[PDB]
Amino acid sequence: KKNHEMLEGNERYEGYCVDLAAEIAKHCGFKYKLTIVGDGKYGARDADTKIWNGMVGELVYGKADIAIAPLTITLVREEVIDFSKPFMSLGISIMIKKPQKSKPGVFSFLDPLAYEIWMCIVFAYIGVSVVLFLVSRFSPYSESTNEFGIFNSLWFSLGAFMQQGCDISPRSLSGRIVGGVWWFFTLIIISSYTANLAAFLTVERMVSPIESAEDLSKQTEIAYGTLDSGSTKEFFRRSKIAVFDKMWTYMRSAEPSVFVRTTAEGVARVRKSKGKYAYLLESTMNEYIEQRKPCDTMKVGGNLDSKGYGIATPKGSSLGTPVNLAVLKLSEQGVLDKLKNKWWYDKGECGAKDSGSKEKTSALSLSNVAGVFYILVGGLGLAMLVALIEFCYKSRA
Amino acid sequence: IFNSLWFSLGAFMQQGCDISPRSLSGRIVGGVWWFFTLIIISSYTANLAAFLTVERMVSPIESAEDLSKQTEIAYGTLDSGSTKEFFRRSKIAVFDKMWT
Amino acid sequence: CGAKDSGSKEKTSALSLSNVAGVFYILVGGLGLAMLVALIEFCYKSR
Amino acid sequence: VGGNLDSKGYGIATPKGSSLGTPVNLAVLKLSEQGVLDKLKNKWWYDKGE
Amino acid sequence: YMRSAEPSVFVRTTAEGVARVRKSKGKYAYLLESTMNEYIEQRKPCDTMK
Numbered sequence: 093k094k095n096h097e098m099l100e101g102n103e104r105y106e107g108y109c110v111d112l113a114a115e116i117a118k119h120c121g122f123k124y125k126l127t128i129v130g131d132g133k134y135g136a137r138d139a140d141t142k143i144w145n146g147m148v149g150e151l152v153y154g155k156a157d158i159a160i161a162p163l164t165i166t167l168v169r170e171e172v173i174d175f176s177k178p179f180m181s182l183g184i185s186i187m188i189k190k191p192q193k194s195k196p197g198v199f200s201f202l203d204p205l206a207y208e209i210w211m212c213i214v215f216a217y218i219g220v221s222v223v224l225f226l227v228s229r230f231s232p233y234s235e236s237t238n239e240f241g242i243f244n245s246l247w248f249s250l251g252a253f254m255q256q257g258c259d260i261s262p263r264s265l266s267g268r269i270v271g272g273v274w275w276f277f278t279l280i281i282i283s284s285y286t287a288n289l290a291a292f293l294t295v296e297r298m299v300s301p302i303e304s305a306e307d308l309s310k311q312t313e314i315a316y317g318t319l320d321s322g323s324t325k326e327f328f329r330r331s332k333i334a335v336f337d338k339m340w341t342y343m344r345s346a347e348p349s350v351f352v353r354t355t356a357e358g359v360a361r362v363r364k365s366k367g368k369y370a371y372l373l374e375s376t377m378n379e380y381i382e383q384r385k386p387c388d389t390m391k392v393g394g395n396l397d398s399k400g401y402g403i404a405t406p407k408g409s410s411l412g413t414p415v416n417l418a419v420l421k422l423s424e425q426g427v428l429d430k431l432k433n434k435w436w437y438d439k440g441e442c443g444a445k446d447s448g449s450k451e452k453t454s455a456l457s458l459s460n461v462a463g464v465f466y467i468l469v470g471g472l473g474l475a476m477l478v479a480l481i482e483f484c485y486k487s488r489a
Numbered sequence: 490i491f492n493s494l495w496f497s498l499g500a501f502m503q504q505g506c507d508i509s510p511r512s513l514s515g516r517i518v519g520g521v522w523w524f525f526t527l528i529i530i531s532s533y534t535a536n537l538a539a540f541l542t543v544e545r546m547v548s549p550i551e552s553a554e555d556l557s558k559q560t561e562i563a564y565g566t567l568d569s570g571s572t573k574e575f576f577r578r579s580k581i582a583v584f585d586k587m588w589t
Numbered sequence: 590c591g592a593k594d595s596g597s598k599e600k601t602s603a604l605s606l607s608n609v610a611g612v613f614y615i616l617v618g619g620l621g622l623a624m625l626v627a628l629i630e631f632c633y634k635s636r
Numbered sequence: 637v638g639g640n641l642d643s644k645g646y647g648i649a650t651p652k653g654s655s656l657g658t659p660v661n662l663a664v665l666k667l668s669e670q671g672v673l674d675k676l677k678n679k680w681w682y683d684k685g686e
Numbered sequence: 687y688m689r690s691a692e693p694s695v696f697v698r699t700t701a702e703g704v705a706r707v708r709k710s711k712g713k714y715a716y717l718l719e720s721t722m723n724e725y726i727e728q729r730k731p732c733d734t735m736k
């Protein structure tokens with residue numbers, strides 16, 4: 093609870109399981125004491141010792157009378173503890189960081205050519221302009237037999253680069269050599285720009301985000317892990333399905349260890365790791381974290397399986413049947429679904445954008461070329477300002 | 490005015506017009522508009538060459554929740570079937586929407 | 590290790606100055622040739 | 637398209653009070669633990685995958 | 687695949703398989719020994735590459 097440091101007793105806790113425990117206590121009529129598990133693990137039978145840890149250990153060894161907690165009903169646990177009928181159902185899901193905040197920069201139109209090419213294009217433009225002035229304008233031995241002053245030279249070379257032509261063309265031999273070599277340069281550079289832009293806009297489609305849990309087994313660029321001592325680790329261990337077996341083999345041979353002690357550590361790892369690491373988790377944990385800030389996450393692909401949550405009791409305990417009956421009654425009454433909405437859907441503040449799904453529409457957006465419009469309007473304003481200052485100077489003098 | 494409309498139309502395509510600004514601020518407008526049209530035309534042809542390659546576009550339903558919001562695609566189950574009964578009793582908000 | 594199958598997905602990356610370096614050499618050589626030709630014609634017509 | 641809307645399976649059914657219920661429940665459990673269910677699922681879904 | 691594919695992909699004689707591959711626009715492949723493959727590859731019409 094927000095005031096758990098000051099509250100005492102069961103008032104310190106809140107959530108789906110706390111409300112479910114309250115409803116179960118009300119229906120059956122017993123008093124209950126909510127206790128945090130000392131081990132921290134969900135539960136599994138340790139190798140070569142058969143000692144159950146976590147929840148199953150607490151239940152079997154007489155430490156606890158009931159476990160109203162997100163426990164997945166599994167066959168290997170039914171042999172030592174008794175579960176109630178599934179009060180909620182889910183499946184194994186896949187967690188991965190969002191593709192990218194790949195928003196195009198304002199000046200993203202300069203991207204197809206490196207900064208050095210633009211710098212050297214400006215330098216080559218200045219050099220060609222100055223040379224085309226020098227070549228066409230020193231004495232023929234009147235001398236002004238052509239219109240290629242320095243300003244007209246700059247205009248001609250700028251027009252030649254943009255492939256828009258110009259009102260003049262060099263008439264001497266050496267002026268024509270300059271024109272020809274500049275024409276070849278601008279042809280090569282414009283073709284290269286178009287070709288490279290097409291290359292980017294094409295290979296930006298083969299991105300093909302991973303899904304279906306089969307891409308994880310197919311490649312190893314994106315690492316994935318599983319909660320330690322959880323039922324998902326056992327699910328991957330026991331399963332003989334080819335894709336699940338392959339992911340099991342990789343995660344067993346992968347180093348450093350991909351396991352996380354607690355689910356929160358896994359969430360932090362997958363959030364921080366540049367989208368390189370994936371987390372294998374249950375669907376409800378995926379869909380709740382998906383709906384909570386910073387909301388840097390989605391849920392990808394369908395559920396890997398179908399396993400339900402149940403309230404577990406020590407084997408042979410008198411609490412098993414009444415609690416199971418209460419769970420079934422609440423399922424009939426819809427209190428379980430109501431609490432599901434209350435704690436999953438009623439805590440949402442989404443959102444639901446940037447899915448890059450249907451939304452994604454080729455039709456290149458304005459944001460990709462928005463810099464060109466800024467340059468255009470800036471140039472228009474500058475031209476009006478230049479005309480005004482020229483008019484003022486030429487009228488006042 | 491009409492000659493300038495023709496020029497700025499001629500400059501957007503790559504067809505050289507029969508006049509040129511010949512002043513300083515006129516040449517500034519001409520130059521910046523030439524750069525704009527160069528970038529836009531190159532983007533159009535590069536994007537088209539991107540699309541004519543590669544396929545696997547469009548999808549009507551992806552999240553199984555869009556059917557509750559969309560109406561152009563009708564959806565139904567087997568009559569007197571278990572799916573019909575499940576929709577008939579489900580209290581999930583989105584499932585209740587589709588059932589209604 | 591392993592390449593995935595043939596994917597090798599990545600950004601295209603921008604053309605470096607090495608890719609179009611030759612056209613700049615062509616251009617500057619053209620400017621040098623043009624200045625040489627202009628001066629040759631000027632000196633020929635100065636005699 | 638999309639994921640599973642619900643989560644429930646397919647089960648062998650008998651009329652209420654039929655003596656056949658317990659043996660067939662034992663049989664389906666034995667098949668599940670023997671992996672025969674997976675073999676039949678492969679034989680009827682994945683072998684004809686062309 | 688060869689056990690599940692229909693119609694039968696197997697051939698009675700090697701020459702039948704070679705003719706099948708040549709006539710089948712490249713949609714059919716033949717499985718054969720390397721040395722005998724080297725001989726068919728080196729004789730006309732010589733459109734057969736390993």
Ligand SMILES: CC1=NN=C(c2ccc(N)cc2)c2cc3c(cc2C1)OCO3
Pocket residue numbers: 194195196197200201202203204205288289292293460461528529531532600601602603
């Ligand atoms: C976010 C990206 N999106 N825009 C273009 C781009 C460039 C020009 C125009 N008109 C439209 C779009 C791009 C092209 C690239 C590139 C990076 C980018 C940035 O690296 C290799 O070529």
Ligand SMILES: N[C@@H](CCC(=O)O)C(=O)O
Pocket residue numbers: 134135162163164319321322323324325373374
């Ligand atoms: N709640 C699971 C932990 C792993 C999982 O999310 O499946 C368990 O009871 O072991």
